[PDB]
Amino acid sequence: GENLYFQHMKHGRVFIIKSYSEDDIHRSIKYNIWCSTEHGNKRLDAAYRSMNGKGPVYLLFSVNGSGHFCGVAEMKSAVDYNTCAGVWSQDKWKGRFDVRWIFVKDVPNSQLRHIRLENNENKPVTNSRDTQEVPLEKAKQVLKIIASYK
Ligand SMILES: CNc1ncnc2[nH]cnc12
Numbered sequence: 001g002e003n004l005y006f007q008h009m010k011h012g013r014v015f016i017i018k019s020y021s022e023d024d025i026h027r028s029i030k031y032n033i034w035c036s037t038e039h040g041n042k043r044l045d046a047a048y049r050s051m052n053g054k055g056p057v058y059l060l061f062s063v064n065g066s067g068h069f070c071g072v073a074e075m076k077s078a079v080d081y082n083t084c085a086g087v088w089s090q091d092k093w094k095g096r097f098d099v100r101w102i103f104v105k106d107v108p109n110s111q112l113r114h115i116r117l118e119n120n121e122n123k124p125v126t127n128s129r130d131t132q133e134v135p136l137e138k139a140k141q142v143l144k145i146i147a148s149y150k
């Protein structure tokens, strides 16, 4: 058989999201919202707005030190930078944007550590920092691995 679904798109951008907090992951799944750092929010906002709805901005979530990704979400709005403070575990985040979680599933780093990022010094995708962008051809490979893991 074959899965040629992901191997076909050109308009799409994909970012790693790191979270120190398991509580924040749960709150994001529950309420379909997220917030990054200042520079992270700016990165995501720029990608969402220049995508202008002609493709998805995907977010690959991983809790720092957990050893695995925990799921996939799509950005669903621009960054609102002036919102209620202290809704996350730490009060160091300013703003909010909408997401839609697509997959909630733990995927061990062992399944993904062979994919390396030419834009991040050929480092494994599993050694990324928050809002590291993933080149589309590597992003396709990661997404197929996540969707097929069981
Ligand atoms: C709510 N946003 C976050 N929560 C915990 N850790 C992080 N690292 C980057 N963004 C976050």
Ligand SMILES: [Cl-]
Pocket (backbone or CB within 6 Å): 079, 080, 081, 082
């Ligand atoms: Cl704003």
